[PDB]
Amino acid sequence: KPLGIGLIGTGYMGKCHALAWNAVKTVFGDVERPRLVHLAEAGLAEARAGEFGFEKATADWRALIADPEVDVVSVTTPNQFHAEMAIAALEAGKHVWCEKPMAPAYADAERMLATAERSGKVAALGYNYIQNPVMRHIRKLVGDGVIGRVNHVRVEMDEDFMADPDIFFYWKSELSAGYGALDDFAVHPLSLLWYLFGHVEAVITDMVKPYPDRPLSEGGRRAVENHDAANVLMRLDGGISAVLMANRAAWGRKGRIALQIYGSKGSILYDQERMNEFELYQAEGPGSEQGFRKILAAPAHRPYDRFIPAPGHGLGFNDLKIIECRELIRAITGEPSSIVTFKDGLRIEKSVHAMAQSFHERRWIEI
Amino acid sequence: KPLGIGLIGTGYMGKCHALAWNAVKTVFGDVERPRLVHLAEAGLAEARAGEFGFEKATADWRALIADPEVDVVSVTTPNQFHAEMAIAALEAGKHVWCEKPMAPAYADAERMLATAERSGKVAALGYNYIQNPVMRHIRKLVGDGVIGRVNHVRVEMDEDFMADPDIFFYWKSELSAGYGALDDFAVHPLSLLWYLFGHVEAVITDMVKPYPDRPLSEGGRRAVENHDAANVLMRLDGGISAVLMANRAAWGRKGRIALQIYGSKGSILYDQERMNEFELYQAEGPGSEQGFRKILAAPAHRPYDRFIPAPGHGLGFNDLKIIECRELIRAITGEPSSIVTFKDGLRIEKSVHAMAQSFHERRWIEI
Amino acid sequence: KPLGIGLIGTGYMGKCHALAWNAVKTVFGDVERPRLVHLAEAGLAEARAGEFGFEKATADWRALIADPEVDVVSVTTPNQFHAEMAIAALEAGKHVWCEKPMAPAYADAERMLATAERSGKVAALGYNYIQNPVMRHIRKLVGDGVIGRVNHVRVEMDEDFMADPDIFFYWKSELSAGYGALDDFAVHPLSLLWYLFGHVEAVITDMVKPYPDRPLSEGGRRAVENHDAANVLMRLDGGISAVLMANRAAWGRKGRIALQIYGSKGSILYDQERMNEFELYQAEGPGSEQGFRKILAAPAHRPYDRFIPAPGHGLGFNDLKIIECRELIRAITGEPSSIVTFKDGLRIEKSVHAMAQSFHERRWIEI
Amino acid sequence: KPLGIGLIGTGYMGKCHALAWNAVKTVFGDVERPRLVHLAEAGLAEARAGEFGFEKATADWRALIADPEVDVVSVTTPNQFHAEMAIAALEAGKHVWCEKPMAPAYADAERMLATAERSGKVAALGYNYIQNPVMRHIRKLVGDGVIGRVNHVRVEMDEDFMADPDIFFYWKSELSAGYGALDDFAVHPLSLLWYLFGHVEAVITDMVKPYPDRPLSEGGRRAVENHDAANVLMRLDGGISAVLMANRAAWGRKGRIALQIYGSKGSILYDQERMNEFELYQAEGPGSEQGFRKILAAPAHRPYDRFIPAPGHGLGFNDLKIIECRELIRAITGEPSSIVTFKDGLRIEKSVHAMAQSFHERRWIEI
Incomplete structure (x- = not known):
């Protein structure tokens, strides 16, 4: 039906x-x-x-x-x-x-x-970043040993909608409504590390409250309770060493998620702000022609093909919700899908809570 | 209704x-x-x-x-x-x-x-590249005199789907069915130039046939009647000196429309492969800090806000059609819209025929 | 001695x-x-x-x-x-x-x-842009057939030192002392094209006078006899179809020489503003991973290694002169060198005079 | 004399x-x-x-x-x-x-x-990165409150000369000759944080040995003793929160030092691989024209002027040693100079030793 x-x-x-x-x-x-x-x-x-x-x-x-x-x-x-x-x-x-x-x-x-x-x-x-065709192609190259064994991974999520210190205080500054950067932003990059590698195993976190307080719309000031920035050293599945940085007050970042992956036979760079490309380096071939290749989203990077039959033309942020919707329907009949389930999301949120604890207790924390 | x-x-x-x-x-x-x-x-x-x-x-x-x-x-x-x-x-x-x-x-x-x-x-x-919030916004800035008076303009449209010489001859290659790079490609840059500037006054074209023939699907070989690259010097409304390049045999160019605009107070660069951004230079403020600003499409560049409410996130190519479709509806009730009418489409195809003529004739042509 | x-x-x-x-x-x-x-x-x-x-x-x-x-x-x-x-x-x-x-x-x-x-x-x-390890290396790759047979080539040289219309009239602005953009700028792209390809066979120029006059240092105003922008369609040795753009009034362009080269098996992009890198596309290998490779100058691109022994570090513009100076010394003992001789310099200035002619005459010109 | x-x-x-x-x-x-x-x-x-x-x-x-x-x-x-x-x-x-x-x-x-x-x-x-004109201009903008109060700072130093696991074991893998990444690479980025901000105050480090062993040139294998990668959370002078990443086995990085600085009124990006530019974002002006500006090294960014009188033409890695040489001579007669003294270097190395300890003791360490 x-x-x-x-x-x-x-x-x-x-x-x-x-x-x-x-x-x-x-x-x-x-x-x-x-x-x-x-x-x-x-x-x-x-x-x-x-x-x-x-x-x-x-x-x-x-x-x-x-x-x-x-x-x-x-x-x-x-x-x-x-x-x-x-x-x-x-x-x-x-x-x-x-x-x-x-x-x-x-x-x-x-x-x-x-x-x-x-x-x-x-x-x-709705961890939609996961559904980008470029990203499914990243997983595939990695899976297929194209860059060898992944040693190190860097991941940045930045925007600037908290950068301006004069915007009125609202729920995004209440501890009881979230940690901040961690709650709001870190889950995406972790959802990405999850999709690509797996769950997080040890973490240690430094956190920033850039502004002590912010005006109230009905007059006066309130203490910021939360943290708009978080830097986390980690270890994933397989002992992979990873750095995560999330920042909501990063002037001039609009929708940035920057991912760098380093293996024993090459590297990958990706940046959400140019969603439709990634850069791939292969220690493979004559040394005087090595370097990163800028690869544009194409019909071969399925399911870009269902949106456009020409390469290099681009999907949009909303296009990622359609694919996620599609994958949800697959699940309903699973049928193998690439979705994030409450089981994996909870596990992801487990890592978030660990990161906060990690900061307040000022120590490494295993999970 | x-x-x-x-x-x-x-x-x-x-x-x-x-x-x-x-x-x-x-x-x-x-x-x-x-x-x-x-x-x-x-x-x-x-x-x-x-x-x-x-x-x-x-x-x-x-x-x-x-x-x-x-x-x-x-x-x-x-x-x-x-x-x-x-x-x-x-x-x-x-x-x-x-x-x-x-x-x-x-x-x-x-x-x-x-x-x-x-x-x-x-x-x-369907001249859709016209409909980009970014393109709409470049129009406004030009309008507001942000870059001064515009004297020079370059536009390149490149793909590489005719790039492999060993692809079987088909309809794309018959003079019967079009000049090739001219009607297939130059028209888009024309609507773009029409949208910001006006119609073309004087042309002069060089054309390129990269591969003299192609293999035939059922054995043998036909000559190529067409031209997969044109380069055109031009004048527009009020003697804006422009150059236009079209090329379907440009390896690596996937969906590239590159526009540079130069005026007495600044410049604007734009690239369809990074469709949700552009670069603006204003000759203003301390010279130790001038340079191109990378502005990312955002809600303030209407009608991006009717799609996503956060900057830096990106419209896809298909969103261009939705905007066009809205403009057509505007026209039907219309109410001034920004659509290309047959009336103006013709004066573009005029330009294009003159374009192909000024080659064959090997001299300048006027319109 | x-x-x-x-x-x-x-x-x-x-x-x-x-x-x-x-x-x-x-x-x-x-x-x-x-x-x-x-x-x-x-x-x-x-x-x-x-x-x-x-x-x-x-x-x-x-x-x-x-x-x-x-x-x-x-x-x-x-x-x-x-x-x-x-x-x-x-x-x-x-x-x-x-x-x-x-x-x-x-x-x-x-x-x-x-x-x-x-x-x-x-x-x-002193055509020094010729002497870049990067440029030397593009020559080799073209030579080795890495991109196939070259059909199309674009070259842009832009600065903006004539961009401010309110700068006092000086010798740069007299026809007496040169055509302006043509002799001052187009020559460099010519040595570049001469270095990889050969001399120009057929030209046709459009020229641009952005500002009809300028103020005078001791009061008043003289007309500008010159032209601060030229755009030229061209043919070279074996009908490589090229386009060349020169412009001293291009705001934001500081030291820009941009070269694109297209062939039957690939393409090469290069930009003097990022002088120690270039981009190479080879139509080769799985299509899900083609794209431009960003190759960074390195010791394997001689004679970079005589300057630094680590890749990615950069020669400055002045290093170009040192290399030239070495080549001149080579010539004097000479021993084949890669220098521009008067003999070849002339055939370039030939091209340039023909360039200025094909404008004034408003027709194609041959050489 | x-x-x-x-x-x-x-x-x-x-x-x-x-x-x-x-x-x-x-x-x-x-x-x-x-x-x-x-x-x-x-x-x-x-x-x-x-x-x-x-x-x-x-x-x-x-x-x-x-x-x-x-x-x-x-x-x-x-x-x-x-x-x-x-x-x-x-x-x-x-x-x-x-x-x-x-x-x-x-x-x-x-x-x-x-x-x-x-x-x-x-x-x-010889902490030469410090002497880049772009970098002196970064210090100046920061000093002058151009981006407000710096909250967060990111700094990456990457190369790939240890990426290949088959290169023979030499001194760069002996603990007694250095920690690795920390000794060899981290001192530069810290020298940069020093120049811009000041010394480091607390640190906690994760470190990577990507390869357990490496061949010996005279036959057999040896244990790698050292770490080719280090990720450090930190706090500098003034409570600024900073992340440092140093990596010597990062395929496709050649001479990368990437620095991102975030303040309450804007941001700065810099990348050694394009030594002659940086990007500056100012929360200042109409919202529909904000974004990073790409600013090219120019005569105003002293002492670029002593090398070249045209912007956008570029210095090289060796040019940075000449400036450092100059500043050394200033010192000799100090005369105010911008050099790094044994006093400040020792202090920098103090932070290095702390980072290693920091990793072996698995805990934050104050300095």
């Missing part, structure tokens, strides 16, 4: 799921038109309902989750709500596509997994 | 039209959801429409121009059939969204013009 | 000649240490020689061509005095290392040729 | 001092021709003595150090020898220009300083 979609939340991530569900089939072709049934948010739900192309609206989400025409729930609400909703969804016997993270506290996340395992439907997280 | 859509062509460009029509509403929010009515193809039709979410599949393409429920005709087929099909839609009172070129010869185009100019409807060509 | 050196000119180019002569031995190891004998200038001479470690300072420049102890004459002065001075050195039996251009008019150059061709000595022009 | 130079060692670093001493005056102009007097190394010393332009040779260095015509000793021999020689030099009442490092053991270095302080002449180390 064609899949019946319930979406909760309509902020950017809601829009992006919606665009994804509305497009998988036309792009990919090998599945059943999803049907956009129910949507939740004030009764602006009826307004957005028009925009995104959903049959029903409501401002009760437990009702969406109740609705028997919905098979799949897209949770894209704020962090605090994920646990509550994903669980009510699972319990009501449905599949879950949930935005990162799972929950800000480990035992909540535990509960989410316990449910899901116990549940019957699948449960995925 | 929500538009009923009619689409001919299932190639990797008809796909683009369907993606576009499917997506506009969700992205932009401020139009009625276009209805997917009629799809035309061989025998594949039935399945294709399954994929592109259409209502009725048929192999008859006049049955399409018939269906009273069709308002817009998307013409996405081989270059030869363009004319006849646009005309049968225009005369039959349907709006036209047509892929370039209008047609191989000036007078079938001249016809197309008058057919539509006399008809009620709107006719648009 | 160690050469006694004679140098006329103390500008920022005579400096270069002295740096060179001072350095060659230590760098290359395999020549005799050139002796700094005679320096020519105004009244500064005495001090200048103090700086450039010379023996005898004089304001008489014939006294120089006299000194029996002088073997090589370095001519580094304003373009006008070049001819007379090269000739008085050639006829007086001295070797000549002369800065470009030979001279503003074809026949003073034609003279220079015969003067030297009849004389015993060696005469070299 | 003009300064009298004694050089010990003739391997690359010897050549580079020699070229520096031979050129300072012609480049800079404001000092006294140094005189190249004595040189030490087998009696190949007489061969190199010709090449570099030194009056006397010998294979006894205690004799060079004895020689009363020598005022300055250039020590450029291998690491182990530095202590012995620099001290014998100082004691014999002479100035010292010594290659990094000081000694592989802290108390040896202590002794070197004790001497020097006690001595009468100056004592400098």
